[PDB]
Write a protein that binds this ligand. Structure first.
Ligand SMILES: O=C(O)[C@H](CC1CC1)Nc1ncnc2[nH]ccc12
Length: 164
């Protein structure tokens, strides 16, 4: 059900789209969230996905943290996708703005290999502070399963395609 994506490699496709709108239309098996270790979904992709679930994602996430404690930077957990997808894979890329190691970005993308097909954002981009060109390069060099990347900003999408 994914449509309008540009093919970058055998397994990586990209589109200029709002990942929330894309999840509502497609209802994928897995949507990836750009999470933090506490699963506090305040802003960016996490805030937008959570708002679209009417805060059900945050209620489920607070119960997960109360039981299990925080995730690691580079780690992930599988929770419900609520009204957006079957599952949500919450993946923690390093936040440069908070001083986290950029080498952990490859470990973060390795989580995608546990799922056959995913709708995802570029990890560590936006308010996480990493260079999005670098994030797309690490994605294409790490993920082996089928990943459909939604890039929100039009100008960034054009820059990523032309420089690939
Ligand atoms: O458009 C995106 O998909 C990302 C993440 C954002 C959607 C949460 N945006 C950006 N990422 C890196 N540098 C940027 N400069 C301006 C925008 C921008």
């Amino acid at each position: 059900s994914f449509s309008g994506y540009l093919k970058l490699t055998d397994n990586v496709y990209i589109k200029n789209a709002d990942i929330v709108e894309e999840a509502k239309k497609v209802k994928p098996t897995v949507v990836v969230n750009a999470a933090n270790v506490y699963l506090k979904h305040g802003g960016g992709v996490a805030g937008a996905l959570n708002k679209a679930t009417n805060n059900a994602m945050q209620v489920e996430s607070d119960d997960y943290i109360a039981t299990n404690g925080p995730l690691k930077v580079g780690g992930s957990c599988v929770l419900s996708g609520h009204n957006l997808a079957k599952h949500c894979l919450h993946v923690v890329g390093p936040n440069v703005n908070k001083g986290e190691d950029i080498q952990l970005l490859k470990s973060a993308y390795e989580n995608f290999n546990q799922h056959e097909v995913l709708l995802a954002p570029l990890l560590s981009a936006g308010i996480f502070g990493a260079d999005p060109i670098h994030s797309l390069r690490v994605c294409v060099d790490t993920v082996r399963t089928n990943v459909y990347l939604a890039v929100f900003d039009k100008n960034l999408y054009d820059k990523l395609v032309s420089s690939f």
